[PDB]
Symmetry: D2
Subunit: 124 residues, 4 copies
């Protein structure tokens, strides 16, 4: 739901995902990474299913951060693909792809893959 | 920036995108494959000040597979880079997540790769 | 080497493995999820002379989901590393490919992640 | 089939995949990468579906290379997951994960993802 997704979320790295789920299916907000070549907040934008199934499945969504802000540029971008699962212990379960700029010859080695689990309470 | 325009991948899907001065990607995506018909909204981000050393321009975008005609309860993100030159291309790898229960969540994401060029695959 | 033994992931699957002197991984895998029953053969490889700087030990293995009882026309590879210490773990990400026609090949691979420890998830 | 898979294959990077598909579902052979921190041949081992479906689908398979041989050790391993599709232009279509040794704190950034298409004739 709009209400369930909008707010502040934290992953296992301690990063802070601040998002608003708009009525039109848009995700907007800011991302602060606790890891990598990043400082302070970055713009994010994405999309979510604004009319999810009523069978107990999660709500599919994704978003992108390009790692450039007013302070620095790490010539890279991450996309997160996953779903919101509501309930007592709400979660956004994601897989991500982090691509960094590379020459054509080195393009084969230009994308990391990983996974982040977002919860409403900070871990550890 | 080279990114703005109409692009096609190897499946024949149509990616119509505008790269704005604020680092945003906006536009529409029409998939030639899967549980999809007509155009879907996309939004993303790109590096608006890329390196000048021959590296590509990092970018990503998302489509949620709901429009006025269909809802496939799923979303794809593409992560990759624009490479300019004689034959400009956008090389991507993608993640397609479909809604699932928590118990079936382990099997909820496909991975793949799409290469986009400006040549209509007529 | 620490790798030889019985490991369990967060799904409750059972990975019984031997890390041999020649860099090979051999053993059996029992999945607690999906189109799978009983044990399946696995084979893989690991770095038999890892760095001494605190880095983990890189490794990977494959299961094809055919045994004497079932054939799910699919295979999973796990890629990751062993990290030793008080609570040894094997952190992995995996790719599960299922047989498909060429036309449906774009939608033929799931991606996920499994973390293995030696604690029976009783 | 055993006959279709066994032999020498080439990917778009110019790497050489030499494999034997055994009756027991085993893949064995050697891999020579044209890219990255690699020289000469490396041992590979994997598995394939030795009784695939008869409906026109491909044959699921995977294999692993640890990037250590008699000459060097790059403290890393790649797995390829994919399928053999037989016919006039036989192919092995794969996705891969390349993991390199990392400390626990840097484990989030320890795996590259990519894709290789193997054919019976060298490209370009
Ligand atoms: O580190 C960042 C930007 C921050 C990413 C933070 C990541 S997003 C997924 C995960 N979840 C989080 O919450 N945080 C992390 N970008 C790089 C990566 C590697 N780079 C190269 C360059 C050249 N060769 C190899 C690698 C340089 C720039
Ligand atoms: O097909 C789509 C939406 C269109 C995706 C098009 C894809 S995007 C990457 C690729 N590049 C393109 O240009 N086109 C393709 N969504 C399905 C996925 C599978 N779904 C399930 C549900 C339950 N269990 C298993 C699978 C149901 C929803
Ligand atoms: O379920 C299995 C085999 C068991 C996989 C167990 C997985 S391995 C990674 C994870 N870690 C574990 O410990 N366990 C799970 N194979 C299916 C996959 C989906 N299949 C299709 C076919 C056609 N269209 C779509 C999907 C049919 C075959
Ligand atoms: O390059 C190789 C080994 C050869 C891989 C060849 C790859 S297999 C998939 C693709 N298909 C091929 O045919 N060939 C390529 N291994 C590394 C990678 C990155 N490494 C680090 C270390 C520390 N921080 C970051 C990165 C160091 C060791």
């Amino acid at each position: 739901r709009e209400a369930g997704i909008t707010g502040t979320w934290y992953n296992q790295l301690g990063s802070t995902f601040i998002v608003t789920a708009g009525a039109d299916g848009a995700l907007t907000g800011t991302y602060e990474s606790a890891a990598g070549k990043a400082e302070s907040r970055y713009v994010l934008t994405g999309r979510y299913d604004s009319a999810p199934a009523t069978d107990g499945s999660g709500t599919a969504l994704g978003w992108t951060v390009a790692w450039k802000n007013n302070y620095r540029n790490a010539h890279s971008a991450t996309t997160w693909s996953g779903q919101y699962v509501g309930g007592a212990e709400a979660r956004i379960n994601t897989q991500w792809l982090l691509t960094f700029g590379a020459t054509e010859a080195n393009g084969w080695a230009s994308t990391y893959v990983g996974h982040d689990t977002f919860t409403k309470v900070k871990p550890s």
